[PDB]
Ligand binder design. Structure first.
Ligand SMILES: [Mg+2]
Ligand SMILES: [Mg+2]
Ligand SMILES: [Mg+2]
Ligand SMILES: [Mg+2]
Ligand SMILES: [Mg+2]
Ligand SMILES: [Mg+2]
Ligand SMILES: [Mg+2]
Ligand SMILES: [Mg+2]
Ligand SMILES: [Mg+2]
Ligand SMILES: [Mg+2]
Ligand SMILES: [Mg+2]
Ligand SMILES: [Mg+2]
Ligand SMILES: [Mg+2]
Ligand SMILES: [Mg+2]
Ligand SMILES: [Mg+2]
Ligand SMILES: [Mg+2]
Ligand SMILES: [Mg+2]
Ligand SMILES: [Mg+2]
Ligand SMILES: [Mg+2]
Lengths: 86, 122, 137, 116, 99
RNA sequence: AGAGUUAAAUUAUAACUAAGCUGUAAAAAGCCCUAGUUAAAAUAAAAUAACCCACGAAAGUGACUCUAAUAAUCCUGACACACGAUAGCUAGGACCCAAACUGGGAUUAGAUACCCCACUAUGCCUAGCCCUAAACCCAAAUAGUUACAUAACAAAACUA
């Protein structure tokens, strides 16, 4: 509002394909959480409720992170087995 | 150097700027301050539009004043810069050269946490 | 071909024109896309309104005007009324998160109008006023 | 990097107050979950709307606009072919990853030890 | 007679120090299509992929040059009492035994 | 705890332009002194950082600046002393926005509810009260050990 206009959350379209520009914008906003934030501010969410969410999210993230880590570590051993029909 | 005065002055011509800086520093020495140095960070377009003294401002001159002052007086100087119509926006910070840098020895890596659960066999 | 996603700052020498105009001189298409309705207003660079079209203006009624189709129809209409007053290129400003966002944009293109830049200015409070309570107690 | 687990859970030893309250214990399971099937949305809606405008304008005589009819048809054919042929390849190829069956087998070959 | 300690102290595996980034010599004892099972003499074999350049020169019995990363691939995962062994070693296949 | 300050929103209020705007699973009622854009004090609340885990005795505390400042050469200890979320009370001031209550609209067999719209006490500031919470990490304080050793579940078992 007091900032200069058009410098922010702005994407310029290339070779006239708009769908792509918009996609890029939406990716920018998804990445910075602006989208989730917008969506979550439609209604209010009482502090305890928010505390609970943050905690659940962080648990969830820890688990996904670690499972992923174990996948990428175990990934080598998916290769065809040498010892078949031993 | 003890306090740092961040001055954003209305953008003006040479003589009037010089005048504003002079009267400002004088006020500082009257609240009992000892002025170490005067730095000029130039005039720029302000990051956003700043409304002060029934004026909506776009550009501004930037200055730093390092000075020592009795703890009591920061409120006084603050009051003074408040009502000067040539100042776009004043601030007084504990001088960043007083705080000294401790040594990051490095990043101590944190091991995954163990024994959060018992040895139960599900 | 060097193509910057970032717009052309005013103080810059930067030379790009669309029909001979600077990036600053191009008209603005404001689009407010809200959950029950989508509104569009094309305006001069100098902020004189050229054209206005909404899903209500387009003769849909209560729930139907929520949908994407409606939004698109408003887009086309807006662009017609706009090209009448002779605006070839327009910079989109999308305000709000709704069912009609994308649709009203590509309706602006469908309706024979050229979109150069598409900006999102959605109110995001940095915590001002408390929004209304949650549904289903 | 994984978020820190130190000090987070409520335990007899921990000095401070809990940060996480996990709903179910944080122990890596020996299988992964099954991929969530994509929610569908209507297809061809744009071509439909264009054809409907063409009709409203020309008073619903089909001879008047053959292009939008034919293109709406073309599109519905591409949505049928899409529904048929995408099911199988989305159900097999995960790209850089493995089908959840293979992951589960791989994870049973090198399981987690909660016990001992 | 040589005390075990004396042997351990002089062995080439003690001489190496940390096994990260060490040039080593290894020998291929098993093959599945592109997979070379290489014994470099430590504990676990490693397994590398047959390179594109001179692919047919790599045969059971061949000798190759390796860059050792980790002597055993091991990690602890969330909720586990002990680490998990892949029962393998981590290496990069360089070329074959320039001689 | 004081004192000072404000970026993003929001609103009084004008200026253009449009007839609608709002609202839902869907409507109605409401508003058209309305809506979009451009300008804007006050008030209130503090995106991101935070995948951090700090401060405080606890309750609590995460916009910015400065001033003052975080007991004990550190065992336990009250009914004594001093504090203590929200709500609530008294008096004065504020009022953007939210909202018990209430009034309208739907829904329903009914609907003194859930859903929609308006609006109040109240949420804010000053001063005084009130002394309660699933004030729960349902795990007393201070030193310790990992020996013996599985009711079950849970956050492993124990000594003084
Ligand atoms: Mg309840
Ligand atoms: Mg503490
Ligand atoms: Mg539970
Ligand atoms: Mg503001
Ligand atoms: Mg007022
Ligand atoms: Mg009505
Ligand atoms: Mg903030
Ligand atoms: Mg102390
Ligand atoms: Mg005591
Ligand atoms: Mg109280
Ligand atoms: Mg109160
Ligand atoms: Mg009162
Ligand atoms: Mg009120
Ligand atoms: Mg309300
Ligand atoms: Mg009623
Ligand atoms: Mg006070
Ligand atoms: Mg509590
Ligand atoms: Mg109790
Ligand atoms: Mg006690």
């Amino acid at each position: 509002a007091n900032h200069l206009k058009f410098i922010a959350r702005t994407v310029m379209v290339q070779e006239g394909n708009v769908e792509g520009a918009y996609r890029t914008l939406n990716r920018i906003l998804t990445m910075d959480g602006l989208i989730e934030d917008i969506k979550r501010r439609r209604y209010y969410e009482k502090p305890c409720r928010r505390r609970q969410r943050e905690s659940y999210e962080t648990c969830r993230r820890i688990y996904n992170m670690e499972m992923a880590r174990k996948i990428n570590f175990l990934m080598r051993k998916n290769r065809a087995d040498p010892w078949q029909g031993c | 150097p003890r306090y740092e005065l961040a001055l954003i002055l209305k953008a003006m011509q040479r003589p009037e700027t010089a005048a504003a800086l002079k009267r400002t520093l004088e006020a500082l020495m009257d609240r009992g301050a000892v002025v170490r140095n005067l730095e000029n960070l130039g005039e720029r377009m302000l990051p956003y539009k700043i409304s002060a003294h029934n004026q909506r401002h776009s550009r501004g001159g930037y200055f730093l004043v390092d000075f020592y002052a009795p703890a009591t007086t920061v409120e006084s100087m603050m009051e003074h810069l408040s009502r000067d119509i040539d100042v776009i926006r004043p601030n007084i910070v504990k001088h960043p050269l007083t705080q000294e840098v401790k040594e990051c020895e490095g990043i101590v890596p944190v091991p995954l946490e163990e024994k959060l659960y018992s040895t139960k066999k599900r | 071909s060097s193509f910057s996603i970032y717009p052309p700052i005013p103080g810059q020498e930067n030379s790009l024109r669309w029909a001979g105009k600077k990036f600053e001189e191009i008209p603005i298409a404001h689009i407010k896309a809200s959950y029950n309705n989508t509104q569009i207003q094309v305006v001069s660079a100098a902020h004189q309104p050229l054209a206005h079209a909404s899903c209500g203006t387009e003769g849909f009624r209560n729930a139907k005007k929520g949908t994407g189709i409606a939004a698109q129809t408003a887009g086309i209409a807006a662009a017609a009324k706009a090209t009448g007053k002779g605006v070839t290129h327009v910079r989109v400003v999308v305000k709000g998160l709704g069912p009609g966002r994308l649709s009203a944009i590509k309706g602006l293109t469908m309706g024979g109008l050229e979109v150069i830049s598409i900006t999102d200015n959605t109110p995001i409070p940095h915590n001002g006023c408390r929004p209304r309570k949650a549904r289903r107690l | 990097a994984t978020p820190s687990l130190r000090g987070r859970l409520a335990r007899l030893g921990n000095p401070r107050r809990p940060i996480l309250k996990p709903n179910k214990p944080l122990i890596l399971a020996n299988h992964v979950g099954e991929r969530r099937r994509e929610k569908g949305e209507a297809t061809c809606i744009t071509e439909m709307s264009v054809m409907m405008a063409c009709w409203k304008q020309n008073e619903f005589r089909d001879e008047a606009c053959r292009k939008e009819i034919q293109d709406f048809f073309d599109c519905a054919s591409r949505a049928e072919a899409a529904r048929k042929m995408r099911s199988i390849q989305e159900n097999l190829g995960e790209l850089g990853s493995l089908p959840p069956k293979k992951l589960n087998k791989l994870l049973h070959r090198f399981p987690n030890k909660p016990h001992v | 007679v040589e005390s075990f300690a004396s042997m351990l102290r002089h062995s080439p595996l003690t001489q190496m120090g940390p096994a990260k980034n060490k040039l080593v010599i290894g020998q291929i004892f098993h093959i599945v299509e592109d997979d070379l099972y290489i014994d470099f003499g430590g504990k676990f074999h490693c397994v590398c992929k047959r390179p594109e350049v001179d692919g047919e020169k790599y045969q059971k019995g061949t000798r190759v040059r390796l860059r050792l990363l980790d002597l055993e691939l091991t990690s602890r995962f969330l909720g586990a009492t002990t680490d998990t062994t892949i029962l393998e070693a981590d290496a990069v296949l360089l070329g074959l035994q320039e001689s």
